[PDB]
Design a protein that fits this description.
heterodimer; A: two-stranded antiparallel sheet; B: about 220 residues; Thrombin, subunit H; seven-stranded antiparallel beta sheet; 13 strands; about 5% helix; binds calcium ion; knottin (chain A); serine protease inhibitor (chain A)
């Protein structure tokens, strides 16, 4: 949703910035 | 970069990769000692990699330089990604040559309809375009009406939209901090969007032309 375009690894949504979610591939988007 | 093409090697010689274990954001060289990027790309120490075309291969053109200072805009707001611009001072000056050249700061704001180039090593959403080789995309600046209509009430004076409302061509994760260059001047820094290359969701960019006073005073403050 508002999601900065930085490449960031994640497991769960809370690892991401703003309204980005952790997408299946292990990265925020 | 989604919907773009592989850049001619070193055609964007101001482009840098910010690396802390892997590429995570881009940036632009604006003189021998300083790089402009996005404030949400902040890390206290980053390695800046210049003269890159394929980031996973040593080509002989590269300069890897550690930051000595990383300075976010004082008014950056993480909640809504406002005033998303940052300066990075290199611990030693870059050697300027055929592969590494600075980009000029803007003399004025570019009007809607100006055609610009954005570049980066981010997600291409394609099995054909390799994100390890620098990608290039030509995008027009959109009017504030179009920009605010796509993201109602979310667009501040420090932001502009650029791209295609039909979708298909856009910047994407891994491109943050990189350049939007229009007629030889850095007009934007890749910042945020909803998804990538979605219809009605163009990319939003930090508007460099309103930060010239902070950028040029900070590049000589210390
Ligand atoms: Ca390389």
């Amino acid at each position: 949703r508002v999601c900065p375009r930085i490449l960031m690894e994640c497991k769960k949504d809370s690892d991401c910035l703003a309204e980005c979610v952790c997408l299946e591939h292990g990265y925020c988007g | 970069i989604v919907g773009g093409y592989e850049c001619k090697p070193y055609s964007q010689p101001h482009q840098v990769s910010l690396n802390s274990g892997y590429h995570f954001c881009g940036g632009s060289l604006v003189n021998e000692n300083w790089v402009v990027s996005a404030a949400h790309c902040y890390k206290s120490r980053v390695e800046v990699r210049l003269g890159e075309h394929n980031i996973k291969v040593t080509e002989g053109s590269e300069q890897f330089i550690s930051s000595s200072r990383v300075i976010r805009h004082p008014n950056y707001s993480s909640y809504n990604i406002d005033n998303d611009i940052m300066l990075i001072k290199l611990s030693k000056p870059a050697t300027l040559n055929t592969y590494v050249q600075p980009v000029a700061l803007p003399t004025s704001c570019a009007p809607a309809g100006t055609m610009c180039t954005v570049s980066g090593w981010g997600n291409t959403m394609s099995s054909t375009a390799d994100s390890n080789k620098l990608q290039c995309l030509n995008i027009p600046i959109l009017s504030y009406s179009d920009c605010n209509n796509s993201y109602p009430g979310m667009i501040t004076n420090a932001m502009f939209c650029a791209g295609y409302l039909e979708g298909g061509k856009d910047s994407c994760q891994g491109d943050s901090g990189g350049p939007v260059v229009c007629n030889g001047e850095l007009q934007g820094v890749v910042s945020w969007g909803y998804g990538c290359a979605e219809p009605g969701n163009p990319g939003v960019y930090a508007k460099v032309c309103i930060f010239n006073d902070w950028l040029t005073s900070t590049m000589a403050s210390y």
